[PDB]
Design a protein around this ligand. Structure first.
Ligand SMILES: CNC(=O)c1scc2c1OCCO2
Length: 119
C-alpha cells in the first residue's frame, strides 16, 4: 500500500524500453527535416525522452498521467504511418504490447494504495 512506489517502477520500465531495439524510432522527438509533413498530421508530438524528463522533474502526479503520454507515442505512430505493414509502425505495435503487459500491475498497485489511504 505504498502510494509513492509507482515512480521508481516507471523509471525501471523506461530503462527496459530504452534497452529494446524497437524503441529506437521513439527515443527522441521525430526529426522534422526527415519528415517535413509530420506536423500536418500530428497535433501533439511525444517521445520517451520527454516522458522520462517529465517523470524525473516531478511533473507527473500519478502513473495514469505517464500512461496517457506513452499511449500518445503509439497513437501518433498509427496516425502517421502510410501502411499498417510499415517497418516503424510494426516496431510501435510490439513495443505497445510490451508496455501494456508491464504497466498493468503498476496501475493496479497504485489504485489499491489510494483506496487503502481513503478506507
Ligand atoms: C518512414 N516512416 C514511417 O513509415 C513511419 S510509421 C510511424 C512513424 C514513421 O516515421 C516517423 C516516426 O513515426
Amino acid at each position: 500500500y505504498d502510494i509513492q512506489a509507482w515512480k521508481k517502477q516507471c523509471e525501471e520500465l523506461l530503462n527496459l524500453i530504452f534497452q529494446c531495439e524497437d524503441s529506437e524510432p521513439f527515443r527522441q522527438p521525430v526529426d522534422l527535416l526527415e519528415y517535413p509533413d509530420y506536423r500536418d498530421i500530428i497535433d501533439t508530438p511525444m517521445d520517451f525522452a520527454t516522458v522520462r524528463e517529465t517523470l524525473e522533474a516531478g511533473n507527473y502526479e500519478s502513473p495514469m498521467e505517464l500512461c496517457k503520454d506513452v499511449r500518445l507515442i503509439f497513437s501518433n505512430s498509427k496516425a502517421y504511418t502510410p501502411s499498417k505493414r510499415s517497418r516503424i509502425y510494426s516496431m510501435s505495435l510490439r513495443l505497445s504490447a510490451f508496455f501494456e503487459e508491464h504497466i498493468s500491475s503498476v496501475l493496479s498497485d497504485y489504485k489499491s494504495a489510494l483506496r487503502f489511504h481513503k478506507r
